[PDB]
């Protein structure tokens, strides 16, 4: 198969973002929030971001913390999985 992917690591998915600060200088508030949780922001795009994580908790100290912090005069979002499309399907058990 090839759809889909398969790595220990961890990469958090944020939402909300200031689009009117230059990223320039987003990013870095971000950096310094995410050096801290262990983290790496490998890219921003659009009002969202994408960094990467050693492992899962590394990944929730960020997102449990950047979901509360403000990059600047406005609430982050952090989530684990994508936000693209939303459903009300009741599947997929939580597991080890």
């Given at each position: ?9 961890t990469?958090l ?27 790496k ?8 971001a994408?960094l ?7 990944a929730?100290?960020?997102?449990k913390?950047m979901?509360?912090?403000?990059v600047f005069?406005n609430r ?6 994508p936000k693209n ?9 939580s597991?080890?």
């Amino acid at each position: 198969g090839s759809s889909g992917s398969s790595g220990c690591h961890t990469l958090l998915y944020v939402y909300n973002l200031p689009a009117n600060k230059d990223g320039k200088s987003v990013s870095n508030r971000l950096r310094r929030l995410s050096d801290n949780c262990g983290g790496k922001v490998l890219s921003i795009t659009g009002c969202s971001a994408i960094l990467r994580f050693i492992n899962q908790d590394s990944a929730e100290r960020a997102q449990k913390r950047m979901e509360n912090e403000d990059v600047f005069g406005n609430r982050i979002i952090v989530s684990f999985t994508p936000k693209n499309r939303e459903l009300c399907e009741t599947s997929g058990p939580s597991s080890g």
